[PDB]
Amino acid sequence: MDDLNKKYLIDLHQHQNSSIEVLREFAEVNEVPIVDRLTLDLIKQLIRMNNVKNILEIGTAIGYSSMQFASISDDIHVTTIERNETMIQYAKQNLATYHFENQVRIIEGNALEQFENVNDKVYDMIFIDAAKAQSKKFFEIYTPLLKHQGLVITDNVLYHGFVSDIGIVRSRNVRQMVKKVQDYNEWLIKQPGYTTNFLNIDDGLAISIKG
Amino acid sequence: DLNKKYLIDLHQHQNSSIEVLREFAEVNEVPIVDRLTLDLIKQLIRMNNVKNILEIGTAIGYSSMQFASISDDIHVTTIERNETMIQYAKQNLATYHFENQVRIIEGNALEQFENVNDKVYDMIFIDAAKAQSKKFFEIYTPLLKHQGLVITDNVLYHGFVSDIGIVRSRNVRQMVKKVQDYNEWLIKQPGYTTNFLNIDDGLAISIKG
């Protein structure tokens, strides 16, 4: 039912397909995780409503979300931090192929140590994955660069739907990730300088407004 | 759906004084906006600094009071035809102290344009399955500001919209058809940018451009 509903809505979204949508095909075939379509289209709407200009993203598979955000307006800037050499190479080639190298900056390295390489701007939105590495630490490190009324968008707050699943008994790695994501969610709701809401769409999404 | 219950549990920290009414709606089988959908709309109101809201369908006044609770300068105009719903909504506005912020317009929503056109609205809230949903969009959107939002709830008609073939009831079939037609028409409106979400009974967010 949820799968049928998702397919039906993605079909409605087919009218707003950008040139970069062709990369979704590459991602599924090559075991490359890309942001889900309905989640991405909601974030694009948030960028429009809030007149977001400067985005900071923690992680990328192939630069898909970076280019989708930059495609909204020529005045959008995206800084993307990525440590994986294969992902860096894929993202770099895509930015060249699709002509986004002036709008998107790839910062190569571990996100625990990139503060001094990205602190040249005040960001309007930070995009994080709750399950990726030290997610709570990334929120604490980078949020001082987010403007008042800026947004923190956290993907994967349901760890692909595993948070409440008995099936986690099958994998130690899935259990460790569920624990990390659950800890992140509880810690996030307790931050007094933020107003947060959660959505059970795709892998789970949280939207936090900085007060 | 345990993931939905997990997220609703996380939202208990943000319960307003109006939340207790959900228990009344459940017992009395009164449909009210779903919690996670509501809390997303509250975030949209904060982000866009929404002050004037036009709601098509009041029911018990749950959503109108929830929107009003965000900030004292918020005004909600709500249209409702059902006498029992009007009675409960008026009772709630008095009980929960929201009379100054919520204006209830009584009557058929096809005929209320002249009673609500004294304001420019920042947000219009519609249900895709309630009566003439496409006609309500056409009638009321001229009052919405540019960059304003149209929020449409129930765009998945409880789940039957994804495949009308699973429907048995003739009444549910005409309903699914109307919602499917609304969604298809909405996504093609050239002066709007719309996205759909499969949260709860489905939600669409349209920016007037």
Side-chain angles (χ1 to χ4, degrees), chain A residues 1 5 8 13 15-16 38 45 49 161 163 185 195-198 201 207 209, chain B residues 3 6 11 14 43 47-48 159 161-162 183 193-196 199 205 207:
Chain A
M1 195 42 62
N5 286 343
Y8 168 70
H13 284 211
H15 304 87
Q16 65 203 59
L38 298 180
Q45 199 88 122
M49 290 173 41
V163 293
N185 295 342
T195 299
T196 302
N197 74 296
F198 298 82
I201 55 152
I207 299 165
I209 304 173
Chain B
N3 285 334
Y6 167 73
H11 283 219
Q14 72 193 92
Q43 290 275 76
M47 288 179 176
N48 288 302
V161 165
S162 62
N183 293 344
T193 301
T194 300
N195 74 292
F196 292 84
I199 48 157
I205 302 163
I207 304 173

PDB file of all heavy atoms in Angstrom, chain A residues 1 5 8 13 15-16 38 45 49 161 163 185 195-198 201 207 209, chain B residues 3 6 11 14 43 47-48 159 161-162 183 193-196 199 205 207:
ATOM      1  N   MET A   1       0.819  -1.212   0.000  1.00  0.00           N
ATOM      2  CA  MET A   1       0.000   0.000   0.000  1.00  0.00           C
ATOM      3  C   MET A   1       0.855   1.265   0.000  1.00  0.00           C
ATOM      4  O   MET A   1       0.628   2.138  -0.841  1.00  0.00           O
ATOM      5  CB  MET A   1      -0.998  -0.002   1.170  1.00  0.00           C
ATOM      6  CG  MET A   1      -2.116   1.036   1.026  1.00  0.00           C
ATOM      7  SD  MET A   1      -2.861   1.167  -0.792  1.00  0.00           S
ATOM      8  CE  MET A   1      -3.589  -0.647  -0.989  1.00  0.00           C
ATOM      9  N   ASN A   5       1.232   3.928  -3.073  1.00  0.00           N
ATOM     10  CA  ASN A   5       1.008   5.360  -2.814  1.00  0.00           C
ATOM     11  C   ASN A   5       2.212   6.179  -3.273  1.00  0.00           C
ATOM     12  O   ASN A   5       2.044   7.186  -3.961  1.00  0.00           O
ATOM     13  CB  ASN A   5       0.747   5.613  -1.326  1.00  0.00           C
ATOM     14  CG  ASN A   5      -0.621   5.193  -0.825  1.00  0.00           C
ATOM     15  OD1 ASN A   5      -1.565   4.983  -1.592  1.00  0.00           O
ATOM     16  ND2 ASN A   5      -0.763   5.106   0.489  1.00  0.00           N
ATOM     17  N   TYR A   8       2.472   6.176  -7.112  1.00  0.00           N
ATOM     18  CA  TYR A   8       1.422   7.051  -7.620  1.00  0.00           C
ATOM     19  C   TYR A   8       1.852   8.541  -7.522  1.00  0.00           C
ATOM     20  O   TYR A   8       1.736   9.276  -8.499  1.00  0.00           O
ATOM     21  CB  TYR A   8       0.109   6.791  -6.869  1.00  0.00           C
ATOM     22  CG  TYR A   8      -0.929   7.851  -7.132  1.00  0.00           C
ATOM     23  CD1 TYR A   8      -1.549   7.952  -8.376  1.00  0.00           C
ATOM     24  CD2 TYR A   8      -1.240   8.802  -6.169  1.00  0.00           C
ATOM     25  CE1 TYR A   8      -2.469   8.960  -8.644  1.00  0.00           C
ATOM     26  CE2 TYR A   8      -2.137   9.835  -6.439  1.00  0.00           C
ATOM     27  CZ  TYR A   8      -2.760   9.900  -7.673  1.00  0.00           C
ATOM     28  OH  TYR A   8      -3.691  10.874  -7.928  1.00  0.00           O
ATOM     29  N   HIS A  13       4.764  13.568  -9.934  1.00  0.00           N
ATOM     30  CA  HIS A  13       5.962  14.411  -9.968  1.00  0.00           C
ATOM     31  C   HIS A  13       6.743  14.321 -11.284  1.00  0.00           C
ATOM     32  O   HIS A  13       7.594  15.177 -11.535  1.00  0.00           O
ATOM     33  CB  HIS A  13       6.881  14.095  -8.777  1.00  0.00           C
ATOM     34  CG  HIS A  13       6.409  14.646  -7.464  1.00  0.00           C
ATOM     35  ND1 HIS A  13       7.309  15.015  -6.479  1.00  0.00           N
ATOM     36  CD2 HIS A  13       5.148  14.852  -7.003  1.00  0.00           C
ATOM     37  CE1 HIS A  13       6.578  15.433  -5.456  1.00  0.00           C
ATOM     38  NE2 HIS A  13       5.274  15.365  -5.727  1.00  0.00           N
ATOM     39  N   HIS A  15       6.156  15.250 -14.223  1.00  0.00           N
ATOM     40  CA  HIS A  15       6.030  16.502 -14.978  1.00  0.00           C
ATOM     41  C   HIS A  15       7.159  17.490 -14.630  1.00  0.00           C
ATOM     42  O   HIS A  15       7.593  18.246 -15.501  1.00  0.00           O
ATOM     43  CB  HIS A  15       4.661  17.159 -14.709  1.00  0.00           C
ATOM     44  CG  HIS A  15       3.479  16.282 -15.006  1.00  0.00           C
ATOM     45  ND1 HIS A  15       2.976  15.399 -14.059  1.00  0.00           N
ATOM     46  CD2 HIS A  15       2.712  16.211 -16.120  1.00  0.00           C
ATOM     47  CE1 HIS A  15       1.933  14.814 -14.631  1.00  0.00           C
ATOM     48  NE2 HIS A  15       1.738  15.269 -15.873  1.00  0.00           N
ATOM     49  N   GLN A  16       7.635  17.476 -13.365  1.00  0.00           N
ATOM     50  CA  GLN A  16       8.710  18.355 -12.884  1.00  0.00           C
ATOM     51  C   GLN A  16      10.118  17.715 -12.890  1.00  0.00           C
ATOM     52  O   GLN A  16      11.008  18.160 -12.154  1.00  0.00           O
ATOM     53  CB  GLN A  16       8.345  19.046 -11.543  1.00  0.00           C
ATOM     54  CG  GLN A  16       8.165  18.112 -10.337  1.00  0.00           C
ATOM     55  CD  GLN A  16       7.306  18.717  -9.254  1.00  0.00           C
ATOM     56  OE1 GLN A  16       6.140  19.075  -9.469  1.00  0.00           O
ATOM     57  NE2 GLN A  16       7.851  18.808  -8.049  1.00  0.00           N
ATOM     58  N   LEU A  38      10.428  11.762  -3.237  1.00  0.00           N
ATOM     59  CA  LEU A  38       9.449  12.617  -2.555  1.00  0.00           C
ATOM     60  C   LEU A  38      10.106  13.471  -1.483  1.00  0.00           C
ATOM     61  O   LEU A  38       9.730  14.630  -1.301  1.00  0.00           O
ATOM     62  CB  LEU A  38       8.264  11.796  -2.003  1.00  0.00           C
ATOM     63  CG  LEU A  38       7.441  11.061  -3.088  1.00  0.00           C
ATOM     64  CD1 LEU A  38       6.300  10.278  -2.460  1.00  0.00           C
ATOM     65  CD2 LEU A  38       6.883  12.028  -4.140  1.00  0.00           C
ATOM     66  N   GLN A  45      10.900  22.341  -2.239  1.00  0.00           N
ATOM     67  CA  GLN A  45       9.809  23.242  -1.900  1.00  0.00           C
ATOM     68  C   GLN A  45      10.196  24.129  -0.700  1.00  0.00           C
ATOM     69  O   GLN A  45       9.882  25.309  -0.682  1.00  0.00           O
ATOM     70  CB  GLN A  45       8.527  22.427  -1.618  1.00  0.00           C
ATOM     71  CG  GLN A  45       7.251  23.241  -1.692  1.00  0.00           C
ATOM     72  CD  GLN A  45       6.647  23.307  -3.084  1.00  0.00           C
ATOM     73  OE1 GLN A  45       5.503  22.912  -3.303  1.00  0.00           O
ATOM     74  NE2 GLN A  45       7.377  23.839  -4.051  1.00  0.00           N
ATOM     75  N   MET A  49      10.224  28.242  -0.503  1.00  0.00           N
ATOM     76  CA  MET A  49       9.482  28.989   0.517  1.00  0.00           C
ATOM     77  C   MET A  49      10.367  29.883   1.367  1.00  0.00           C
ATOM     78  O   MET A  49       9.961  30.984   1.727  1.00  0.00           O
ATOM     79  CB  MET A  49       8.819  28.013   1.490  1.00  0.00           C
ATOM     80  CG  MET A  49       7.689  27.235   0.919  1.00  0.00           C
ATOM     81  SD  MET A  49       7.215  25.963   2.297  1.00  0.00           S
ATOM     82  CE  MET A  49       7.326  26.947   3.719  1.00  0.00           C
ATOM     83  N   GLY A 161      13.251   2.659   7.957  1.00  0.00           N
ATOM     84  CA  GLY A 161      12.061   2.017   8.501  1.00  0.00           C
ATOM     85  C   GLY A 161      12.356   0.956   9.542  1.00  0.00           C
ATOM     86  O   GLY A 161      11.426   0.343  10.069  1.00  0.00           O
ATOM     87  N   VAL A 163      13.677   1.363  12.632  1.00  0.00           N
ATOM     88  CA  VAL A 163      13.530   1.787  14.035  1.00  0.00           C
ATOM     89  C   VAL A 163      12.605   0.961  14.940  1.00  0.00           C
ATOM     90  O   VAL A 163      12.969   0.721  16.103  1.00  0.00           O
ATOM     91  CB  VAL A 163      13.352   3.312  14.241  1.00  0.00           C
ATOM     92  CG1 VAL A 163      14.611   4.072  13.850  1.00  0.00           C
ATOM     93  CG2 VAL A 163      12.139   3.832  13.490  1.00  0.00           C
ATOM     94  N   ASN A 185      17.494  11.369  17.392  1.00  0.00           N
ATOM     95  CA  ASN A 185      16.130  11.929  17.443  1.00  0.00           C
ATOM     96  C   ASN A 185      15.766  12.495  18.818  1.00  0.00           C
ATOM     97  O   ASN A 185      15.254  13.610  18.913  1.00  0.00           O
ATOM     98  CB  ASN A 185      15.107  10.917  16.977  1.00  0.00           C
ATOM     99  CG  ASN A 185      15.273  10.543  15.524  1.00  0.00           C
ATOM    100  OD1 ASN A 185      15.924  11.256  14.728  1.00  0.00           O
ATOM    101  ND2 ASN A 185      14.750   9.394  15.158  1.00  0.00           N
ATOM    102  N   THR A 195      12.950  24.255  16.716  1.00  0.00           N
ATOM    103  CA  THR A 195      11.573  23.769  16.634  1.00  0.00           C
ATOM    104  C   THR A 195      11.596  22.664  15.564  1.00  0.00           C
ATOM    105  O   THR A 195      11.874  22.977  14.394  1.00  0.00           O
ATOM    106  CB  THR A 195      10.620  24.933  16.368  1.00  0.00           C
ATOM    107  OG1 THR A 195      10.734  25.861  17.455  1.00  0.00           O
ATOM    108  CG2 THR A 195       9.200  24.493  16.232  1.00  0.00           C
ATOM    109  N   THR A 196      11.333  21.402  15.967  1.00  0.00           N
ATOM    110  CA  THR A 196      11.423  20.225  15.075  1.00  0.00           C
ATOM    111  C   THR A 196      10.136  19.471  14.842  1.00  0.00           C
ATOM    112  O   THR A 196       9.350  19.258  15.769  1.00  0.00           O
ATOM    113  CB  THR A 196      12.521  19.251  15.607  1.00  0.00           C
ATOM    114  OG1 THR A 196      13.762  19.949  15.668  1.00  0.00           O
ATOM    115  CG2 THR A 196      12.685  17.973  14.767  1.00  0.00           C
ATOM    116  N   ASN A 197       9.950  18.974  13.604  1.00  0.00           N
ATOM    117  CA  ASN A 197       8.867  18.062  13.309  1.00  0.00           C
ATOM    118  C   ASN A 197       9.414  16.892  12.512  1.00  0.00           C
ATOM    119  O   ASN A 197      10.381  17.062  11.756  1.00  0.00           O
ATOM    120  CB  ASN A 197       7.689  18.722  12.597  1.00  0.00           C
ATOM    121  CG  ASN A 197       7.977  19.026  11.168  1.00  0.00           C
ATOM    122  OD1 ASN A 197       8.854  19.831  10.883  1.00  0.00           O
ATOM    123  ND2 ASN A 197       7.326  18.312  10.248  1.00  0.00           N
ATOM    124  N   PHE A 198       8.797  15.724  12.665  1.00  0.00           N
ATOM    125  CA  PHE A 198       9.187  14.493  11.982  1.00  0.00           C
ATOM    126  C   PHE A 198       8.122  14.023  11.033  1.00  0.00           C
ATOM    127  O   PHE A 198       6.921  14.142  11.318  1.00  0.00           O
ATOM    128  CB  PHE A 198       9.509  13.369  12.991  1.00  0.00           C
ATOM    129  CG  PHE A 198      10.659  13.665  13.913  1.00  0.00           C
ATOM    130  CD1 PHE A 198      10.477  14.444  15.049  1.00  0.00           C
ATOM    131  CD2 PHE A 198      11.927  13.156  13.655  1.00  0.00           C
ATOM    132  CE1 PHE A 198      11.544  14.707  15.910  1.00  0.00           C
ATOM    133  CE2 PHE A 198      12.978  13.375  14.545  1.00  0.00           C
ATOM    134  CZ  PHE A 198      12.789  14.166  15.655  1.00  0.00           C
ATOM    135  N   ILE A 201       7.922   9.674   5.782  1.00  0.00           N
ATOM    136  CA  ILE A 201       7.986   9.613   4.332  1.00  0.00           C
ATOM    137  C   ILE A 201       9.327   9.002   4.033  1.00  0.00           C
ATOM    138  O   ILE A 201      10.311   9.341   4.697  1.00  0.00           O
ATOM    139  CB  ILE A 201       7.832  10.984   3.609  1.00  0.00           C
ATOM    140  CG1 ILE A 201       8.838  12.071   4.085  1.00  0.00           C
ATOM    141  CG2 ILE A 201       6.385  11.450   3.630  1.00  0.00           C
ATOM    142  CD1 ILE A 201       9.172  13.140   2.989  1.00  0.00           C
ATOM    143  N   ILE A 207      12.569  18.191  10.159  1.00  0.00           N
ATOM    144  CA  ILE A 207      12.779  19.574   9.780  1.00  0.00           C
ATOM    145  C   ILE A 207      12.907  20.354  11.068  1.00  0.00           C
ATOM    146  O   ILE A 207      11.970  20.326  11.889  1.00  0.00           O
ATOM    147  CB  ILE A 207      11.629  20.129   8.917  1.00  0.00           C
ATOM    148  CG1 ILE A 207      11.472  19.338   7.596  1.00  0.00           C
ATOM    149  CG2 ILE A 207      11.780  21.658   8.676  1.00  0.00           C
ATOM    150  CD1 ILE A 207      10.065  19.660   6.922  1.00  0.00           C
ATOM    151  N   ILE A 209      13.833  24.215  12.691  1.00  0.00           N
ATOM    152  CA  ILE A 209      13.995  25.654  12.465  1.00  0.00           C
ATOM    153  C   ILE A 209      14.840  26.193  13.612  1.00  0.00           C
ATOM    154  O   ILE A 209      14.449  26.018  14.771  1.00  0.00           O
ATOM    155  CB  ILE A 209      12.640  26.430  12.430  1.00  0.00           C
ATOM    156  CG1 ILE A 209      11.672  25.866  11.362  1.00  0.00           C
ATOM    157  CG2 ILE A 209      12.914  27.931  12.202  1.00  0.00           C
ATOM    158  CD1 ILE A 209      10.222  26.508  11.398  1.00  0.00           C
TER     159      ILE A 209
ATOM    160  N   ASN B   3       6.110   2.965  13.091  1.00  0.00           N
ATOM    161  CA  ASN B   3       6.980   4.115  12.802  1.00  0.00           C
ATOM    162  C   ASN B   3       6.205   5.408  13.019  1.00  0.00           C
ATOM    163  O   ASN B   3       6.737   6.348  13.602  1.00  0.00           O
ATOM    164  CB  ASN B   3       7.569   4.031  11.391  1.00  0.00           C
ATOM    165  CG  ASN B   3       8.678   3.013  11.258  1.00  0.00           C
ATOM    166  OD1 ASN B   3       9.374   2.683  12.219  1.00  0.00           O
ATOM    167  ND2 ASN B   3       8.874   2.499  10.058  1.00  0.00           N
ATOM    168  N   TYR B   6       5.928   5.843  16.699  1.00  0.00           N
ATOM    169  CA  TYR B   6       7.231   6.269  17.197  1.00  0.00           C
ATOM    170  C   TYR B   6       7.393   7.788  17.012  1.00  0.00           C
ATOM    171  O   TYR B   6       7.727   8.483  17.965  1.00  0.00           O
ATOM    172  CB  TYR B   6       8.357   5.444  16.533  1.00  0.00           C
ATOM    173  CG  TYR B   6       9.742   6.010  16.749  1.00  0.00           C
ATOM    174  CD1 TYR B   6      10.372   5.916  17.987  1.00  0.00           C
ATOM    175  CD2 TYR B   6      10.415   6.665  15.722  1.00  0.00           C
ATOM    176  CE1 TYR B   6      11.632   6.478  18.203  1.00  0.00           C
ATOM    177  CE2 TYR B   6      11.692   7.193  15.916  1.00  0.00           C
ATOM    178  CZ  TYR B   6      12.287   7.117  17.164  1.00  0.00           C
ATOM    179  OH  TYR B   6      13.535   7.651  17.366  1.00  0.00           O
ATOM    180  N   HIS B  11       6.656  13.700  19.164  1.00  0.00           N
ATOM    181  CA  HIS B  11       5.915  14.967  19.120  1.00  0.00           C
ATOM    182  C   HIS B  11       5.154  15.279  20.429  1.00  0.00           C
ATOM    183  O   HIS B  11       4.710  16.417  20.620  1.00  0.00           O
ATOM    184  CB  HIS B  11       4.942  14.975  17.931  1.00  0.00           C
ATOM    185  CG  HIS B  11       5.605  15.229  16.604  1.00  0.00           C
ATOM    186  ND1 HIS B  11       4.998  16.009  15.640  1.00  0.00           N
ATOM    187  CD2 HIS B  11       6.807  14.815  16.138  1.00  0.00           C
ATOM    188  CE1 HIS B  11       5.842  16.038  14.614  1.00  0.00           C
ATOM    189  NE2 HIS B  11       6.938  15.338  14.868  1.00  0.00           N
ATOM    190  N   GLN B  14       5.718  18.570  22.107  1.00  0.00           N
ATOM    191  CA  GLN B  14       5.102  19.762  21.509  1.00  0.00           C
ATOM    192  C   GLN B  14       3.553  19.798  21.568  1.00  0.00           C
ATOM    193  O   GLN B  14       2.954  20.644  20.903  1.00  0.00           O
ATOM    194  CB  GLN B  14       5.648  20.015  20.078  1.00  0.00           C
ATOM    195  CG  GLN B  14       5.178  19.036  18.983  1.00  0.00           C
ATOM    196  CD  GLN B  14       5.985  19.163  17.717  1.00  0.00           C
ATOM    197  OE1 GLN B  14       6.989  18.474  17.518  1.00  0.00           O
ATOM    198  NE2 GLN B  14       5.550  20.033  16.819  1.00  0.00           N
ATOM    199  N   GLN B  43       4.815  23.969  11.113  1.00  0.00           N
ATOM    200  CA  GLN B  43       6.177  24.371  10.719  1.00  0.00           C
ATOM    201  C   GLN B  43       6.119  25.261   9.471  1.00  0.00           C
ATOM    202  O   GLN B  43       6.867  26.238   9.374  1.00  0.00           O
ATOM    203  CB  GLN B  43       7.066  23.148  10.455  1.00  0.00           C
ATOM    204  CG  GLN B  43       7.406  22.407  11.730  1.00  0.00           C
ATOM    205  CD  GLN B  43       8.602  23.003  12.432  1.00  0.00           C
ATOM    206  OE1 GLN B  43       8.512  24.050  13.080  1.00  0.00           O
ATOM    207  NE2 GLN B  43       9.754  22.360  12.305  1.00  0.00           N
ATOM    208  N   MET B  47       7.718  29.016   9.130  1.00  0.00           N
ATOM    209  CA  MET B  47       8.665  29.326   8.040  1.00  0.00           C
ATOM    210  C   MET B  47       8.226  30.480   7.177  1.00  0.00           C
ATOM    211  O   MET B  47       9.048  31.292   6.744  1.00  0.00           O
ATOM    212  CB  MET B  47       8.758  28.130   7.103  1.00  0.00           C
ATOM    213  CG  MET B  47       9.491  26.981   7.673  1.00  0.00           C
ATOM    214  SD  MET B  47       9.424  25.617   6.322  1.00  0.00           S
ATOM    215  CE  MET B  47      10.469  24.409   7.205  1.00  0.00           C
ATOM    216  N   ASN B  48       6.930  30.506   6.828  1.00  0.00           N
ATOM    217  CA  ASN B  48       6.411  31.538   5.938  1.00  0.00           C
ATOM    218  C   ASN B  48       5.839  32.729   6.633  1.00  0.00           C
ATOM    219  O   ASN B  48       5.321  33.613   5.947  1.00  0.00           O
ATOM    220  CB  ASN B  48       5.358  30.966   5.008  1.00  0.00           C
ATOM    221  CG  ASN B  48       5.972  30.091   3.998  1.00  0.00           C
ATOM    222  OD1 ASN B  48       6.849  30.504   3.239  1.00  0.00           O
ATOM    223  ND2 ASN B  48       5.665  28.823   4.117  1.00  0.00           N
ATOM    224  N   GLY B 159      -5.910   5.903   1.090  1.00  0.00           N
ATOM    225  CA  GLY B 159      -5.086   4.884   0.449  1.00  0.00           C
ATOM    226  C   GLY B 159      -5.608   4.326  -0.863  1.00  0.00           C
ATOM    227  O   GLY B 159      -4.865   3.643  -1.571  1.00  0.00           O
ATOM    228  N   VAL B 161      -6.554   5.915  -3.698  1.00  0.00           N
ATOM    229  CA  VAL B 161      -6.200   6.688  -4.887  1.00  0.00           C
ATOM    230  C   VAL B 161      -5.105   6.037  -5.770  1.00  0.00           C
ATOM    231  O   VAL B 161      -5.164   6.156  -7.001  1.00  0.00           O
ATOM    232  CB  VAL B 161      -5.916   8.157  -4.497  1.00  0.00           C
ATOM    233  CG1 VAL B 161      -5.207   8.908  -5.599  1.00  0.00           C
ATOM    234  CG2 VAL B 161      -7.198   8.878  -4.116  1.00  0.00           C
ATOM    235  N   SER B 162      -4.132   5.340  -5.142  1.00  0.00           N
ATOM    236  CA  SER B 162      -3.004   4.674  -5.822  1.00  0.00           C
ATOM    237  C   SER B 162      -3.428   3.591  -6.821  1.00  0.00           C
ATOM    238  O   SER B 162      -2.672   3.292  -7.746  1.00  0.00           O
ATOM    239  CB  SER B 162      -2.017   4.107  -4.810  1.00  0.00           C
ATOM    240  OG  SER B 162      -2.628   3.124  -3.991  1.00  0.00           O
ATOM    241  N   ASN B 183      -5.878  15.914  -8.143  1.00  0.00           N
ATOM    242  CA  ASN B 183      -4.408  15.834  -8.096  1.00  0.00           C
ATOM    243  C   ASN B 183      -3.762  16.107  -9.426  1.00  0.00           C
ATOM    244  O   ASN B 183      -2.782  16.849  -9.492  1.00  0.00           O
ATOM    245  CB  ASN B 183      -3.954  14.479  -7.597  1.00  0.00           C
ATOM    246  CG  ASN B 183      -4.294  14.224  -6.160  1.00  0.00           C
ATOM    247  OD1 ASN B 183      -4.615  15.139  -5.385  1.00  0.00           O
ATOM    248  ND2 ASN B 183      -4.249  12.961  -5.766  1.00  0.00           N
ATOM    249  N   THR B 193       3.572  25.781  -7.972  1.00  0.00           N
ATOM    250  CA  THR B 193       4.575  24.723  -7.877  1.00  0.00           C
ATOM    251  C   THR B 193       4.116  23.826  -6.739  1.00  0.00           C
ATOM    252  O   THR B 193       3.931  24.301  -5.616  1.00  0.00           O
ATOM    253  CB  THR B 193       5.993  25.266  -7.701  1.00  0.00           C
ATOM    254  OG1 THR B 193       6.283  26.097  -8.838  1.00  0.00           O
ATOM    255  CG2 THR B 193       7.042  24.135  -7.605  1.00  0.00           C
ATOM    256  N   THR B 194       3.832  22.556  -7.055  1.00  0.00           N
ATOM    257  CA  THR B 194       3.268  21.606  -6.083  1.00  0.00           C
ATOM    258  C   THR B 194       4.133  20.385  -5.848  1.00  0.00           C
ATOM    259  O   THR B 194       4.784  19.877  -6.773  1.00  0.00           O
ATOM    260  CB  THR B 194       1.833  21.210  -6.563  1.00  0.00           C
ATOM    261  OG1 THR B 194       1.029  22.374  -6.646  1.00  0.00           O
ATOM    262  CG2 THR B 194       1.146  20.179  -5.674  1.00  0.00           C
ATOM    263  N   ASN B 195       4.146  19.901  -4.593  1.00  0.00           N
ATOM    264  CA  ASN B 195       4.774  18.635  -4.242  1.00  0.00           C
ATOM    265  C   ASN B 195       3.771  17.847  -3.409  1.00  0.00           C
ATOM    266  O   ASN B 195       2.989  18.440  -2.664  1.00  0.00           O
ATOM    267  CB  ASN B 195       6.089  18.787  -3.493  1.00  0.00           C
ATOM    268  CG  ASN B 195       5.935  19.220  -2.054  1.00  0.00           C
ATOM    269  OD1 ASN B 195       5.530  20.337  -1.788  1.00  0.00           O
ATOM    270  ND2 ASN B 195       6.242  18.344  -1.106  1.00  0.00           N
ATOM    271  N   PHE B 196       3.818  16.521  -3.511  1.00  0.00           N
ATOM    272  CA  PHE B 196       2.940  15.620  -2.778  1.00  0.00           C
ATOM    273  C   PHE B 196       3.763  14.768  -1.822  1.00  0.00           C
ATOM    274  O   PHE B 196       4.904  14.405  -2.121  1.00  0.00           O
ATOM    275  CB  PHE B 196       2.196  14.682  -3.744  1.00  0.00           C
ATOM    276  CG  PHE B 196       1.174  15.338  -4.646  1.00  0.00           C
ATOM    277  CD1 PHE B 196       1.560  15.938  -5.841  1.00  0.00           C
ATOM    278  CD2 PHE B 196      -0.180  15.301  -4.329  1.00  0.00           C
ATOM    279  CE1 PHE B 196       0.611  16.523  -6.690  1.00  0.00           C
ATOM    280  CE2 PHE B 196      -1.130  15.910  -5.173  1.00  0.00           C
ATOM    281  CZ  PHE B 196      -0.723  16.515  -6.345  1.00  0.00           C
ATOM    282  N   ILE B 199       2.349  11.151   3.617  1.00  0.00           N
ATOM    283  CA  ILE B 199       2.277  11.216   5.073  1.00  0.00           C
ATOM    284  C   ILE B 199       0.815  11.078   5.390  1.00  0.00           C
ATOM    285  O   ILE B 199      -0.002  11.725   4.719  1.00  0.00           O
ATOM    286  CB  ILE B 199       2.867  12.485   5.739  1.00  0.00           C
ATOM    287  CG1 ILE B 199       2.393  13.797   5.088  1.00  0.00           C
ATOM    288  CG2 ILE B 199       4.372  12.386   5.842  1.00  0.00           C
ATOM    289  CD1 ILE B 199       2.488  15.038   6.002  1.00  0.00           C
ATOM    290  N   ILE B 205       1.406  20.400  -1.106  1.00  0.00           N
ATOM    291  CA  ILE B 205       1.802  21.771  -0.763  1.00  0.00           C
ATOM    292  C   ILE B 205       1.990  22.489  -2.076  1.00  0.00           C
ATOM    293  O   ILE B 205       2.773  22.052  -2.913  1.00  0.00           O
ATOM    294  CB  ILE B 205       3.111  21.790   0.100  1.00  0.00           C
ATOM    295  CG1 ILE B 205       2.943  20.969   1.401  1.00  0.00           C
ATOM    296  CG2 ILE B 205       3.532  23.261   0.381  1.00  0.00           C
ATOM    297  CD1 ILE B 205       4.272  20.634   2.045  1.00  0.00           C
ATOM    298  N   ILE B 207       2.733  26.264  -3.945  1.00  0.00           N
ATOM    299  CA  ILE B 207       3.158  27.660  -3.798  1.00  0.00           C
ATOM    300  C   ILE B 207       2.570  28.440  -4.975  1.00  0.00           C
ATOM    301  O   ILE B 207       2.792  28.061  -6.133  1.00  0.00           O
ATOM    302  CB  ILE B 207       4.704  27.799  -3.797  1.00  0.00           C
ATOM    303  CG1 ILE B 207       5.367  26.929  -2.684  1.00  0.00           C
ATOM    304  CG2 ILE B 207       5.076  29.298  -3.648  1.00  0.00           C
ATOM    305  CD1 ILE B 207       6.900  26.932  -2.785  1.00  0.00           C
TER     306      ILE B 207
END
